[PDB]
Amino acid sequence: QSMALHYYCRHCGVKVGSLESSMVSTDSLGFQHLTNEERNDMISYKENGDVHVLTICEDCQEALDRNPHYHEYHT
Numbered sequence: 001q002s003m004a005l006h007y008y009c010r011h012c013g014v015k016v017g018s019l020e021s022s023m024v025s026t027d028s029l030g031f032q033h034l035t036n037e038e039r040n041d042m043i044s045y046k047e048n049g050d051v052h053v054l055t056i057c058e059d060c061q062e063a064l065d066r067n068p069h070y071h072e073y074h075t
């Protein structure tokens with residue numbers, strides 16, 4: 001199944017790596033004994049990857065490419 005790092009966007013807070021998590025249970029960490037999804041990750045090695053990366057989404061990339069560093073701070 002299509003699995004990798006969990007992508008959460010820098011600044012705009014969009015989930016860039018979580019859409020098909022409904023059937024692709026690789027997004028949820030097997031904490032203890034929650035759902036069947038957690039039961040699957042309950043293996044002695046996080047199958048979900050243990051990866052929470054903050055990256056640029058399409059939107060922010062365009063904030064990037066269309067605006068120099070996506071505007072300035074204040075001055």
Ligand SMILES: [Zn+2]
Pocket residue numbers: 009010011012013014056057058059060061
């Ligand atoms: Zn973004």
